[PDB]
């Protein structure tokens, strides 16, 4: 596992605490993330460098080693820099608006679609055609962004819908 073997530098502003049963808590300026890992993995912290060690070269271990390493890296990056996903509303009359904590989507349905973010996730609407999902947990930022995109996934005849920023929507010619 090239990925697993890679060493993780912890920024000065992030504290990683290893608790019982391979539960790692990572604290930084943007918040705290706690996660339990598989017992077999050996997570060491030495001189601000996090290292992950696999007990054997068994299929499961080689896979787990890379995953554990990647998740810990995402936790450290998440509490320091955070994760942000950007969505672009493409369509005539398609608009996003923030109502308190709720995202309100007007995407050509007979009713507005409201999305309530989970705890630890902020939704920003910098423009009526742009939505930014921000948070510490990469998985959660991704899940919510997918939830938003699902309201009206991009269609191919005119690319209308909610897309990821920079998403190459496959296009078919109509008439």
Partner RNA sequence: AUACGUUAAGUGGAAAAGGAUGUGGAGUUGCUUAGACAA
Partner RNA sequence: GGCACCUCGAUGUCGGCUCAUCGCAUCCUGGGGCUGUAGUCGGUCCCAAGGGUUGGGCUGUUCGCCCAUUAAAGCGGUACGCGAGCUGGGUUCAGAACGUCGUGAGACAGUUCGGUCCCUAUCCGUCGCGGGCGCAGGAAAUUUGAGAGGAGCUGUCCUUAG
Partner RNA sequence: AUAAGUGCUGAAAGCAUCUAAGCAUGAAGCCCCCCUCAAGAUGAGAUUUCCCAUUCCGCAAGGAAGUAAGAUCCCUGAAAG
Give the binding site for RNA (CB under 7 A). 1-4, 38, 59-60, 62-67, 70-71, 74, 85, 110, 138-143, 146, 150, 156-157, 172, 174-175
Q: How many CA atoms lie within 13 A of 129 on its CB side?
A: 8
CA distance linking residue 159 with residue 126, whole number of Å: 21
Minimum gap (Å) between residue 3 Cβ and RNA? 4
- Tokens 């993780």 belong to 8
Find out whether 106 and 93 touch, Cβ atoms under 8 Å.
Answer: yes
Which segments within the chain are labelled E, that is strand? 8-9, 15-19, 23-28, 31-36, 42-46, 49-53, 83-90, 95-99, 102-106, 113-115, 121-127, 130-135, 161-164
Minimum gap (Å) between residue 110 Cβ and RNA? 4
CB-wise, 12 or 108, nearer to RNA? 108
CB-wise, 26 or 141, nearer to RNA? 141
* Break positions in the chain: residue before each gap, C to N over 2.5 angstroms: none
CB-wise, 47 or 113, nearer to RNA? 113
CB-wise, 47 or 119, nearer to RNA? 119
CB-wise, 12 or 14, nearer to RNA? 14
Minimum gap (Å) between residue 157 Cβ and RNA? 4
Minimum gap (Å) between residue 52 Cβ and RNA? 10
Minimum gap (Å) between residue 144 Cβ and RNA? 8
């Amino acid at each position: 596992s090239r990925v697993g073997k890679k060493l993780l530098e912890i920024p000065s502003d992030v504290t990683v605490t290893l608790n019982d049963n391979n539960t790692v808590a990572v604290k930084g300026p943007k918040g705290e993330l706690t996660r339990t890992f598989h017992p077999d993995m050996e997570i060491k912290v030495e001189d601000n460098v996090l290292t992950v060690a696999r007990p054997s070269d068994q299929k499961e271990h080689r896979a787990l080693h890379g995953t554990t390493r990647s998740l810990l890296g995402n936790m450290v990056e998440g509490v320091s820099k955070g994760f942000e996903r950007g969505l672009e509303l493409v369509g005539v009359g398609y608009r996003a608006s923030k109502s308190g904590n709720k995202l309100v989507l007007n995407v050509g349905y007979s009713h507005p679609v409201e999305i309530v973010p989970e705890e630890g996730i902020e939704i920003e609407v910098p423009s009526q055609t742009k939505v930014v999902v921000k948070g510490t947990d990469k998985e959660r930022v991704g899940a919510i962004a997918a939830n938003i995109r699902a309201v009206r996934s991009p269609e191919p005849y005119k690319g209308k819908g909610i897309r990821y920023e920079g998403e190459v929507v496959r296009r078919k010619e109509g008439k």
